[PDB]
Amino acid sequence: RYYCEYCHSYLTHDTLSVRKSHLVGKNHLRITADYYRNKARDIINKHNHKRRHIGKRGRKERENSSQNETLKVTCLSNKEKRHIMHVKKMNQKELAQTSIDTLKLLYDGSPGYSKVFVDANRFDIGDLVKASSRSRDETCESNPFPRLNNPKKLEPPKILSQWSNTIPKTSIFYSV
Amino acid sequence: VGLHFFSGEFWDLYLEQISSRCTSSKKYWNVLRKILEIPLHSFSKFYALWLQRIDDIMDLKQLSQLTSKDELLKKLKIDINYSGRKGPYLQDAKKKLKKITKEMYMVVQYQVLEIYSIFESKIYINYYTSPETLVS
Amino acid sequence: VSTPELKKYMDKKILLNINGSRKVAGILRGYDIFLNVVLDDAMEINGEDPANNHQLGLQTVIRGNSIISLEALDA
Amino acid sequence: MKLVNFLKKLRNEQVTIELKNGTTVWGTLQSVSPQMNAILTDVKLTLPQPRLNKLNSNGIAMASLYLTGGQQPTASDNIASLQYINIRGNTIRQIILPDSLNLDSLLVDQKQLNSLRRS
Amino acid sequence: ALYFQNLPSRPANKENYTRLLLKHINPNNKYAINPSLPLPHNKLLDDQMGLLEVSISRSSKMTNQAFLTFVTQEEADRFLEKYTTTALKVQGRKVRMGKARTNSLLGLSIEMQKTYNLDIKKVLKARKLKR
Amino acid sequence: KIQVAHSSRLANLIDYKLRVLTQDGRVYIGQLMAFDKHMNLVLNECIEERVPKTQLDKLRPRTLNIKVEKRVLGLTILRGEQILSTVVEDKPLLSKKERLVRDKKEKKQAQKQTKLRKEKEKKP
Amino acid sequence: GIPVKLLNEAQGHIVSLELTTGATYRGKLVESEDSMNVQLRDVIATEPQGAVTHMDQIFVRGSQIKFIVVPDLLKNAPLFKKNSSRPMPPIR
Amino acid sequence: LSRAELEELEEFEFKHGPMSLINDAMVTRTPVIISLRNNHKIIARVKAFDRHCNMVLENVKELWTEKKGKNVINRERFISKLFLRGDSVIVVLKTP
RNA sequence: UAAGAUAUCAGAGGAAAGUCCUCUGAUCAAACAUGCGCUUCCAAUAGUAGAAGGACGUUAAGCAUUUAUCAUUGAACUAGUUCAUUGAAGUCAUUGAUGCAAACUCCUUGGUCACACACGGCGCGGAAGGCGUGUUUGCUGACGUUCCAUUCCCUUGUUUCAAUCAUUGGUUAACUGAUUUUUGGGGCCCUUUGUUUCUUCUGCCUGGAGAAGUUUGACACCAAAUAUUGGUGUUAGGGGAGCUGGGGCCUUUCAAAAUUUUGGAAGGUCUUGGUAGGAACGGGUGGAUCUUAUAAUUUUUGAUUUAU
């Protein structure tokens, strides 16, 4: 007999094709997509709880650290730490999905932009994406002069929220 | 082409290839110390990565990979050989170390927001086109 | 046991390496469970492209104990 | 008949498996598999010296001898001692079994007698 | 004839422990190769430049300490003045060492060559130390 | 070094960092995870180690040091045809007692899933 | 056997090869059958004397494969669970 | 076929077939010469054989010769009892 | 891909030959216990160390070497060499590759345990084997069906001393030992890094706290499309009572043999393990192994000792 252990279910009618109908079935794909999403975070979320080995401290260092004053520690509340871990987890999700693609935005009206950045129609990748519009025929006859009320200004540089109040308050020149 | 104002996405390749490939994790701190001093368009994506490391530093030995044993004790006055009850001491070291990042984020941000607001905002065309193209 | 699925390959020009050094390009007709393969208009490739290259025969069948790789040089 | 079923009864004996390479393996034998996967214990795997005024020995086997991690640095001649070596069957050329054991007790296969006694 | 203090206790086998004791004393010595070890009988040298035999008990009284005998008394001191009270360290710990109050046990075999009553004496007192 | 169990077959020593030899004189050293009828095996974090042709004159009979050129390749599936022998290198990260503990908690947790699945399939 | 069942778990991910001739292919793995023979798509092929090329589609007799290197996140796919609890099968 | 049918077939091919040369050499206590694909030959007496052509031998005398730039030597190695894997052999003759 | 099988041997018994089945021996194996003066290993603090393994790290363009296409046509040329043109293929590299060696830096691992600073064992562990007895079992695991099953308490910085309080025992109200409550003093740890990392909720470094809960359940987390459904994981550690298994020892009772040995029953003492599932039975049940199809190109019945 045969079964798929992501779904945990046995196949009802065993043939080769019923397997392939289950192997590329919508239900089964959503399981195996979700199964590896759980094993991804679990290696990171279950952080290596290391084992400590405490040495018997010296007579010398015990006197040199006694004269040194005891520093204050900061412990947050349970309600506080449940929110701050909700934030810091959601922040690391953002740094995954940045993908800084300003450079594609800069060469928009150039003479080979269809052939290099559209990426349905390169050579290296182009045959593979057609399986799984802005065509390759585009030349520099259409849109001769870019600035004819068409172009958008460059989106300004991003900044950190936490340190949003380090910015100089006034601009040097008067913008419109 | 490292100081190119739009080089942001070049370094993101280079940092992808250190983490992925190399084992030690002393080059990844060494390179990222450079990107912090350059006025790139997207610099805040590189301070976010520095601040995600500093927080995840969990032992005092891991502050040696940032900067030398001496320059820690002189410029900030924190010691790695401090044997004691470390928890608050490393919680202090971070707060003292995170500060001089923030003063560097004050330095670069002035240089970026100058260059963006004066020059780079206005320049609408960064490519060649042809000998028949005319610029504004 | 199972037949190798080269169903998408057939009738395209195909280079393949016989044992070690010899390379044989032709148009793939048929195949079997052992990967013994038969192809039309064969030509033995070498270092000098027109010079040392010579044609083999109208139909030739290769034993699957000497196929290493079989690249499909067409769509 | 399978004569590999003879080897299974030869268990806890000193033996020399001698491989296709030319590498001899002197050791204490354990469970031989049906495909002749012999698995030894207190072993000493070596290469002989084909003398003939420095004829070069097996180049591949010298590499595989050092790689095992058993060759000690001050081994002057080419030997390597270790515990536990599992050996894939097809590589066995010979097996030099010891002088003491009697073949006549062991070469009587049980499934040979159990076919004739049953008929 | 010499007597050490605070040596590492833990390597429990004698042939293995004296390997470490020979290793820290003389790097690139005879025994950093590991085929075989010499064993002189009660009544040959281990390493060059003075060394002959080492001796270590497991008893609770002679715990971290270990006797050590040389070829002669001047060479035994010549080893102590090789370092000249600059404390060298085996595995991890700095050794403090002095001259042995009791004479070297195999040195007496060398001295009287230059001894059954001593062997009679050992049996008698150890029976009384048993009491 | 490490003393392996005197009667321990290839099924027993899962998680033991092995030292597998192929026919060409190249060795793959890693944690074993599966095996098979015809003895092809899945190592976890293996490293191929090769003695280069230049170093090989040094192993001919006369402390020797050999420059072994190695390359990392994590999680392989070897082939049987190629294996020549195996030898054991390290022992697993978890104890013998602790590998029984993790079995019984997982044997308990696996059974709990089925009964929670069967009663979620029965009524709905 | 798990060694082969793993290779089916790696469809549509980048893998490597090493054919017993001493080549090294590394491209996305499209098909595999039970005899460990594979079809790779969009590959980079390294000849035994170092020469590298690119070929769109390749088939290899499984008999000549020396090893396959798989993505490292399948190290904890459920082939490797020791104690598994399958439900009672449906009646045919 | 059945399991009993193959037992008849195996007894035939050992008795009335090509391997009858080995089987008639085991019974009659006649020494054989064997050539392995090693290119060295063993002069021995057979004590058992099998399907795969592997065989247990007794009073083995191997005779192996090697050459390196047209310089020959003939080495002789004696063994009491040996077990020979069957793929190695290419030709078995039966001595007169 | 299929079929078959689930240790072997020997004896007695049931339906002259063999098969089927059953209890009695031997041998073999697994699991579990449990022993051996069994074997090996388990890191400074009386100090700023060190052992094993790395670095796909640096010094470093180190030092020492050797390498950068072939064919066709003309000119000059010695009697090979350079220049220009035409064709063929062409991993990148020359800060390379190959050989030699050192120094430094940094990473992962552990009993950084207890007692002692004392002229060739028999401290309490943990890790890894070898060897020996005993019991169970004879491939192993879910699932169903009838049955046997059937507990608690304290603690989650730790240790030590002092103060008092309470309880129990010894002896002539007093003394002593054990245990518990409130305070104070001292020692060590707090990286527990989400400040105890069994959950949830409250909460903290001038403190180690408080509330609720514990498996047909609860909690955490991930995924969506417009609350729901589908997935992964957590539910712990320490001590004591009980209850029960195994081990050694002692005394008693009994049977055999010539005061002793061997076996069985009970009580006492030391030590060690378990403490919520277990038995029978049942299936067109799962997986392991074994034999044969299978020595005929895709693994194991030879094309890697470079050989004439």
UniProtKB/Swiss-Prot annotation, chain B:
Main location group: nucleus
Motif Nuclear localization signal: chain residues: 94-99
Domain of life: Eukaryota
UniProt keyword list: mRNA processing, mRNA splicing, Nucleus, Repeat, Ribonucleoprotein, RNA-binding, Spliceosome
UniProt feature coiled coil, ranges: none
HAT repeat placement: 27-59
Nucleus in keyword set: yes
Any single GO CC term annotated in Swiss-Prot or TrEMBL for this entry: spliceosomal complex
Keyword Cell division among record annotations: no
Cell compartment(s), UniProt: Nucleus
GO annotation, biological process: mRNA 5'-splice site recognition; mRNA splicing, via spliceosome
GO MF entry, a single one: RNA binding
Function, in words: Essential component of the U1 snRNP particle, which recognizes and binds the 5'-splice site of pre-mRNA. Together with other non-snRNP factors, U1 snRNP forms the spliceosomal commitment complex, that targets pre-mRNA to the splicing pathway. U1 snRNP is cotranscriptionally recruited to intron-containing genes. Required for U1 snRNP biogenesis.
Further comment: Present with 1730 molecules/cell in log phase SD medium.
Self-association state and partner proteins as the record states: Component of the 18S U1 snRNP particle, a subcomplex of the spliceosome.
Protein name: U1 small nuclear ribonucleoprotein component PRP42
UniProtKB/Swiss-Prot annotation, chain C:
Compartments reported by the entry: Nucleus; Cytoplasm
Residues in coiled coil: none
PROSITE patterns, A to Z: SM
Sm domain: residues covered: 1-75
GO CC list: catalytic step 2 spliceosome; commitment complex; cytoplasm; nucleus; precatalytic spliceosome; SMN-Sm protein complex; spliceosomal complex; spliceosomal tri-snRNP complex
Cross-referenced InterPro entries: Lsm7/SmG-like (IPR044641), LSM_dom_sf (IPR010920), Sm (IPR047575), Sm_dom_euk/arc (IPR001163), Sm_G (IPR034098)
Keywords, alphabetical: Cytoplasm, mRNA processing, mRNA splicing, Nucleus, Ribonucleoprotein, RNA-binding, Spliceosome
Domain of life from the UniProt record: Eukaryota
KW ATP-binding (keyword) present: no
Record-linked SUPFAM superfamilies: Sm-like ribonucleoproteins (SSF50182)
GO molecular function terms listed in the Swiss-Prot or TrEMBL record: RNA binding
Chief subcellular location: nucleus
Example GO biological process: mRNA 5'-splice site recognition
Complex formation: Component of the Sm core complex, present in spliceosomal snRNP U1, U2, U4/U6 and U5. The core complex contains SMB1, SMD1, SMD2, SMD3, SME1, SMX3 and SMX2 (Sm proteins B, D1, D2, D3, E, F and G, respectively), and is probably a heptameric ring structure. SMX2 specifically interacts with SME1.
Note: Present with 1400 molecules/cell in log phase SD medium.
Function: Plays a role in pre-mRNA splicing as a core component of the spliceosomal U1, U2, U4 and U5 small nuclear ribonucleoproteins (snRNPs), the building blocks of the spliceosome.
Family of this protein: Belongs to the snRNP Sm proteins family.
PANTHER family: SMALL NUCLEAR RIBONUCLEOPROTEIN, SMALL NUCLEAR RIBONUCLEOPROTEIN G
The protein's name: Small nuclear ribonucleoprotein G
Gene from which the chain derives: SMX2
Swiss-Prot record, chain E:
Compartment list: Nucleus
Ranges where the RRM domain occurs: 1-102
Effect on the protein upon substituting L2I: Sensitive in DMS protection of U1 snRNA
Function: Involved in nuclear mRNA splicing. The principal role of the U1A is to help fold or maintain U1 RNA in an active configuration. It is the first snRNP to interact with pre-mRNA. This interaction is required for the subsequent binding of U2 snRNP and the U4/U6/U5 tri-snRNP.
Misc: Present with 2950 molecules/cell in log phase SD medium.
Family: Belongs to the RRM U1 A/B'' family.
Quaternary data: Component of the spliceosome where it is associated with snRNP U1.
Protein name, per record: U1 small nuclear ribonucleoprotein A
Curated annotation (Swiss-Prot), chain H:
Domain Sm per the UniProt entry, residue ranges: 19-96
BP-aspect Gene Ontology terms: 7-methylguanosine cap hypermethylation; mRNA 5'-splice site recognition; mRNA splicing, via spliceosome; spliceosomal complex assembly; spliceosomal snRNP assembly; U2-type prespliceosome assembly
UniProt keyword RNA-binding, yes or no: yes
InterPro entries (UniProt xref): LSM_dom_sf, Sm, Sm_D2, Sm_dom_euk/arc
Gene Ontology molecular functions: RNA binding
Gene label: SMD2
Self-association and partners: Component of the Sm core complex, present in spliceosomal snRNP U1, U2, U4/U6 and U5. The core complex contains SMB1, SMD1, SMD2, SMD3, SME1, SMX3 and SMX2 (Sm proteins B, D1, D2, D3, E, F and G, respectively), and is probably a heptameric ring structure.
Disulfide bonds: none
Coiled-coil regions listed: none
Localization per record: Nucleus; Cytoplasm, Cytosol
Keywords per UniProt: Cytoplasm, mRNA processing, mRNA splicing, Nucleus, Ribonucleoprotein, RNA-binding
Gene Ontology cellular component annotations, sorted alphabetically: catalytic step 2 spliceosome; commitment complex; cytoplasm; cytosol; nucleus; pICln-Sm protein complex; precatalytic spliceosome; Prp19 complex
Signal sequence, renumbered to the chain: none
Gene3D superfamilies hit by this protein: 2.30.30.100
RNA-binding among keywords: yes
Further remarks about this protein from its record: Present with 799 molecules/cell in log phase SD medium.
Family stated for the protein in its record: Belongs to the snRNP core protein family.
Designated name of the protein: Small nuclear ribonucleoprotein Sm D2
A Pfam family it matches: LSM
Function according to Swiss-Prot or TrEMBL: Plays a role in pre-mRNA splicing as a core component of the spliceosomal U1, U2, U4 and U5 small nuclear ribonucleoproteins (snRNPs), the building blocks of the spliceosome.
Record CDD domains: Sm_D2 (cd01720)
